[model samples]
Target: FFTRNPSELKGKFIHTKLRKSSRGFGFTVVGGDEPDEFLQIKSLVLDGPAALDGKMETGDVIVSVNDTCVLGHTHAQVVKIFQSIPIGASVDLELCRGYPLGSSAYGSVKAYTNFDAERDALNIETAIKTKGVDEVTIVNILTNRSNEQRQDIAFAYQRRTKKELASALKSALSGHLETVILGLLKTPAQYDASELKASMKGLGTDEDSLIEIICSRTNQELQEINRVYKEMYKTDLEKDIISDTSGDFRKLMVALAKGRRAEDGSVIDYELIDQDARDLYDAGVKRKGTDVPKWISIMTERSVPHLQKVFDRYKSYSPYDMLESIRKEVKGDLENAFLNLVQCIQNKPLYFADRLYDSMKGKGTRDKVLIRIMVSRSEVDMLKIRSEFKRKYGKSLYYYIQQDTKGDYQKALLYLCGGDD
Candidate 1:
């Protein structure tokens, strides 16, 4: 038979609300269709699998946690569910927006996950719940992750679907694999086994695995894991990894783990940003020369809150724009390389100028061309770009962005650059 198992852990959904001494809030996902951009509890989905779903009343915006704004948070950020949070810990939530408008449209949710022993155990008979079409299929598949449970799921679904075991699994399934299992009473498959090829060759290194993990995950996801790495894994993931390497090689790993900056790559850690900025400064700028792409990729995807945090450090550390400093200090291809890295990372104008020049004068148009098309996207894409700016330029693209872009293009571009950019 064929198989398609989960690539990684199957995480759960969560709910949060913006609080108020207020009225007129809506518990709706005001973002887009996909979970990637943004999401809120919809009145329709309302609660979780067993808890209150759409309790976020109208007139609220989640302002803060323990009195901090959710502005820089990714979807993973707002989730109250955790493996551990001491009971009775008060997490204050603040909500608001610009203009005269404020939290009047926001609210927060504070339900905790059932992480105690009663909740931790997995049941082979348990059915999986998710919004995706392959829910039943996934349940059967996960049950079959090991051989023992596979036959049971095949039988359970066979009873539910009321057909020959193989016929039932086949008819209930959709998409690419639907045709493969027509003859089996039921079949099991593994998800993402091929994905393990990169790290699974028994050659997982700190740097390689770290980069692969960083590139594959979103900011919120990384921060969540970062938090888990600290609490469950015990050691500070960043500091521990940083200790094992030195100079630019270490810098590359550190920056990648911190992410492109979209989800506050510097989340909950005020001082880390300074070190990160210095790393960027020393690597692509201050040092004789550095790996431009390695540095660029991290800053490329970071969030604004994180970028701004880094920017505060950069300005304090040096007088000039970091990228400009690189150009002033370096020479030749390395110079052009750093210059390109610096310009493209922070400012679309600079990044695009390079793109335009590359297209007008060199190899066909680069990503900057298709990029002009993204102006129509939305605000959150902007957040991801904020970090992208820093990684590329070793400076806040916001700086160059504000000075250059204007109008709707500017507005749209700023959001794409991530907030103030």
Candidate 2:
């Protein structure tokens, strides 16, 4: 099952059919003739179960797994992958068979494969490593050192796997930061009187680590991190962050503490989206220097119930709802552009989704909003956002993505977004 070119097959791997299925359905062996007959495989099933299949002799070179070009992978690795894709699924295989003198290739029947978490573990380094420093801080924030989220996140994670969610996270990571991130995800940080501590590690905080922790995480995640931070340091993470940082950046950090969410899971209120839309609609086009900071207060600093009240006012006037209005009202090159604030206030995240969509439709923005979201939020809260996007936009997020992106970036984004490679 080896190929002539092996370099290209990195990150692509072989797996069993049953292992690949939602409940583990194995490969379908097709009976056929030479040059026209061969075993089919998954793009990821390059060198595992299919290669190890008893029917085929060793020394087969898989020219293609399904329809993908397998230019670079080992013979052993390619031959052994399991092909558990479902019936009616296309299993295209191009095998260049060796018959003492030379070789020839052909395609095979198709099978549909479910997304297996085992295969996903192989891709994490790339997803995380591709993220630079600023984004890593966000990654660390969204995943680690929070007790308040464990039950919810744990429940979510378990729903996807047979094992504990934190256990899955543990197997997927490596190195010091990996340790720091995983440990916090698994165990809530403990507090002793006024102190912050890891509920699991009881690991004390380091200044560099603390700065990284505070800067990268969202507010809700941080509040949970605060519990651990206090357990480790005897002071709250918010207090420590306030002590260490100053000025606008500090305000931004504090604002992030005001519950910065890149994606709204079931916990987030989309009703707020409808509400903020109406608020901006009523505010009457947002003139320059007129309550700009007031705009900030209305958008931020309110409890969910209070925000709901403001939203009630918004619904009374607008028929199309909050998110729909921003799409209709906001325009580019407006000089001061205060109305877009309504879009932002409606829901920073939903607004960001609009930005991501706008970045691909028509003229498109220079900013890699798509890349940024994929890199930063793929492992963060994206699954939750994706569900929300589908609910609000009347289409799958990936459907828009297929229209918007190309090549590896698209595949990588889709994979990270849990679309399966």
Model 1 reaches what TM-score against the true structure?
Answer: 0.29
Model 1 residue runs over 4 Å out of place are: 1-319, 330-368, 371-421
lDDT of each: 0.39, 0.42
The residue-by-residue lDDT of candidate 2 on 5-65, one tens digit each, is 4353332333222223332223333322222333333222335344444333333344556
TM-score of each: 0.29, 0.33
* Over 4 Å off, model 2: 1-218, 222-289, 314-349, 363-367, 388-395
Q: Who wins the lDDT comparison?
A: 2
lDDT of 1 by residue, 5-51 (tens): 21221323223543221121223333222223322333322333212
- Local error of candidate 2 at 31, Å? 51
